[PDB]
Design a protein around this ligand. Structure first.
Ligand SMILES: Cc1cc2nc3c(=O)[nH]c(=O)nc-3n(C[C@H](O)[C@H](O)[C@H](O)COP(=O)(O)OP(=O)(O)OC[C@H]3O[C@@H](n4cnc5c(N)ncnc54)[C@H](O)[C@@H]3O)c2cc1C
Ligand SMILES: Cc1cc2nc3c(=O)[nH]c(=O)nc-3n(C[C@H](O)[C@H](O)[C@H](O)COP(=O)(O)OP(=O)(O)OC[C@H]3O[C@@H](n4cnc5c(N)ncnc54)[C@H](O)[C@@H]3O)c2cc1C
Lengths: 450, 449
């Protein structure tokens, strides 16, 4: 079919859908063209071996006002992650300690080092901000040093550096600390409101959506009805100064005034542009890549850890699994754990057979929470790297030096072509909130000019 | 049309064509499917405002024995870049000095610092090598430190650091030194036989091909006749364990036992794979990017600099143009300069209007060679970044940390799908020689099976 619309939107993840929703409200017509047999993108609720799991994005923090607002608008409610009882910390020396409170049970020297690093990052994030970190006078120096090297420059305490790395490298960017810059760490902190917010799992991992995060996209897509096209990978965008023609599998042709590419930036070159994008985009797009993390799901007859006075929370910068949390579904009697294996550790796990990887990861969960962790009734690994329409997790970031070199241009339209994803967002960077904010920002931009 | 072949080759640059040539010799049938209206890829001879120029790859060094061998095979001859007279060095302080000999005319302290850095890089390249740099016990530490930070760790002398950087960062990888690792610098040096080879422009920029480097591809393609398809972007590769179907514009369908993707790695995801490539490739391919350099051409009525006793060679790490050389065509009476503006300096130039960029570049050429440099009869910038079938120059390299993380897998076939380009080569890495070696290495792999 061929259709005429004010705006053609490539991708029905939260960003593309939030944009379509905002455009429709202003009276513009849209078509949303989506590669997969479903909406939601990097958010996805699925049933594996009889257990319902959130395969992708799921958490809502208090700072995420755009997503919170949208949840309310869509009639969706939240619930909080279980956090009663003691957390587990595993030190660099391999000592496991149960604790409560807002600091790891390390010695006083390491605690003071970590406190000072957290304060310095808070200071930098407050000064530099998330909107245009590249514009700050400090940006060049921060962007040309790796976060690893910056931490070495700030502190001689290895355990403090590794823990501070846990929160940004493994915890957020899902790339090793030698591979992204200090400026990118500052961006990540600023985007969540402060570095302190990223340190506190009760903030950044505060809540989930009743019915699952994928319902945000599902409900937006439902309102759009026949303007959403599924199983329709976009192959070609033909464009000039006054419009664009979007071509997708299934003989879909959308003639529009503007186009939104609502896909992560590592996938821009999946599409042929006629004429080609300018050299700026050709070059900039190559310097964006997704991280890698394995989101591990383990389902048990009960949340057994709670019976032992544990919250289900565990941290260990030197473990294959560096974070574990209670991820029990709302009103579920069965317990579910969620755990993360990041970057180079994820590579190492994928080198093993499935059997051996599962055994290794469950051994790591057993180290945190005890031998019952090794007996799940359902076990699943989210494998976003294998998905051709994603290719990693959680989200994209520049290579080292790329943020200051290209950052100013990452949201700039090319003629009628706009870009919208969490991966180029300011506040909410890399998160559903960022996707929503970018969708809304892009819609407002298009509305104002039309 | 639909055809059956032993091997379908995506891309008619030197790598794809070298592979096809080798395969035919062993009696395997091929089709070479090429996006552009021409062969040669990043090698390209073109005429701009009536002047013949080499828009892309052009130089042959003595270490490049695979290319030299191929040249002989194709009946192509070489000539040497003009190098008589004095070179020009511009110091960090902006001092311009004419000189001869194999070291910059800096003070003795800076000269010693540079010598020590060159020796250390030579040592590292000899130990680590170009074949599998990631496998060496020193590799992990070298790959997790930027070349900039490594230079800071080795020497306090900024002028020495910046000059060493000129040879690797601006001069080869065409990325800033803060963005790639020490191991990547070591790889680049090893790939050319030593760091010392990269320092000496009489080695790495020794010779050009009579008739132009593109003739290497043109002659290989001519021998293949109707098995080369032009104006045929490959869109889809459908595959299983025993074969592949390659689909290209113009209703081209090639059914083959094996496929060679003979394209730079930043372009692998231009093609849809059915089924998708494994997660290893999905991830690794995102961490590969081309550098950026503006290859500047300036044509004059004569090689005026020679009249002033200058070779045309100039170096200045703090100039917008950090290198300039005599690039006069073989038997041409007109003089042609070649100059290079790299990475972030290239970005800064492209921010200016064409008029202002030209004026800025030529003012830099005039600093090296005098006011006559500002009056070329023809002026041209190679703009590989704009080319959708290249998207930068010279070649691709991993982001920081990528070489040790993914290097071992950069040549690994996926079922029937092989990978061949200069950007994943060992010896001759990023150069025509590397493209040729990889094409031949890939062919031998398939032939032996
Ligand atoms: C394992 C995992 C855990 C996460 N955890 C958190 C967390 O808990 N909290 C949170 O806030 N977020 C988290 N994230 C990140 C969050 O899910 C993403 O930031 C968000 O989904 C990004 O939305 P988007 O619309 O910007 O991109 P996407 O969700 O990726 O949507 C892009 C869409 O484009 C489609 N597409 C791509 N190319 C084409 C094409 N050529 N033609 C047509 N369609 C195309 C894709 O199929 C996809 O549907 C998580 C993500 C993952 C993977
Ligand atoms: C300005 C510049 C100066 C250079 N200087 C030197 C130097 O002097 N000496 C030297 O040795 N080399 C130098 N190089 C590098 C050298 O040119 C390259 O290393 C070499 O050409 C790489 O060959 P290749 O076959 O590996 O890739 P390419 O030459 O890039 O060939 C790849 C081919 O694949 C085609 N293609 C891409 N995608 C598709 C698709 N989907 N379907 C069909 N076809 C496709 C492209 O059009 C291209 O023709 C230079 C390069 C540039 C750009």
């Amino acid at each position: 079919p061929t259709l005429q619309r004010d705006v053609a939107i490539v991708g029905a993840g939260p960003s593309g859908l939030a944009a379509a929703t905002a455009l429709r409200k202003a009276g513009l017509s849209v078509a949303v063209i989506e590669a997969r047999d479903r909406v939601g993108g990097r958010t996805w609720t699925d049933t594996i071996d009889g257990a319902v799991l959130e395969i992708g994005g799921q958490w809502v923090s208090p700072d995420q006002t755009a997503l919170i607002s949208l949840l309310d608008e869509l009639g969706l409610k939240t619930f909080e992650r279980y956090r009663e009882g003691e957390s587990v910390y595993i030190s660099s020396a391999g000592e496991r300690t149960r604790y409560t409170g807002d600091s790891f049970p390390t010695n006083e020297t390491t605690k003071k080092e970590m406190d000072r690093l957290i304060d310095e990052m808070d200071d930098l994030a407050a000064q530099i901000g998330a909107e245009e970190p590249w514009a700050h006078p400090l940006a060049r120096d921060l962007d040309t040093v790796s976060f690893k090297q910056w931490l070495i420059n700030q502190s001689d305490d290895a355990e403090a550096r590794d823990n501070i790395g846990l929160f940004i490298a493994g915890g957020m960017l899902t790339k090793p600390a030698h591979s992204f810059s200090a400026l990118q760490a500052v961006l990540m902190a600023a985007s969540a409101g402060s570095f302190s917010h990223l340190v506190d799992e009760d903030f950044i991992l505060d809540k989930r959506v009743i019915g699952g995060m994928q319902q945000v996209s599902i409900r937006m897509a439902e309102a759009l009805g026949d303007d959403v096209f599924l199983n329709a990978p976009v192959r070609t965008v033909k464009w000039n100064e006054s419009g664009a023609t979007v071509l997708a599998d299934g003989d879909i042709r959308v003639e529009a005034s503007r186009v939104i590419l609502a896909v992560p930036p590592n996938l821009y070159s999946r599409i042929s542009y006629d004429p080609p994008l300018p050299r700026r985009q050709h070059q900039m797009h190559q310097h964006q890549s997704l991280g890698l993390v394995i989101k591990v799901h383990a389902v048990y007859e009960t949340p057994f850890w709670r019976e032992d006075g544990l919250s289900g929370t565990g941290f260990g910068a030197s473990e294959v699994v560096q974070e574990v949390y209670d991820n029990t579904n709302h009103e579920d009697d069965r317990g579910t754990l969620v755990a993360f294996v990041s970057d180079e550790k994820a590579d190492a796990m994928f080198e093993l057979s499935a059997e051996e990887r599962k055994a290794t990861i469950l051994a790591s969960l057993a180290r945190y929470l005890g031998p019952k962790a090794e007996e799940p009734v359902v076990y699943y690994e989210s494998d976003w790297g294998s998905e051709e329409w994603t290719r990693g997790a959680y989200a994209a970031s520049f290579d080292l030096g790329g943020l200051h070199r290209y950052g100013a241009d990452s949201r700039t339209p090319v003629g009628p072509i706009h870009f919208s994803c969490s991966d180029i967002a300011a506040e909410g960077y890399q998160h559903v909130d960022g996707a929503v904010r970018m969708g809304q920002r892009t819609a407002a931009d298009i509305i104002a000019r039309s």
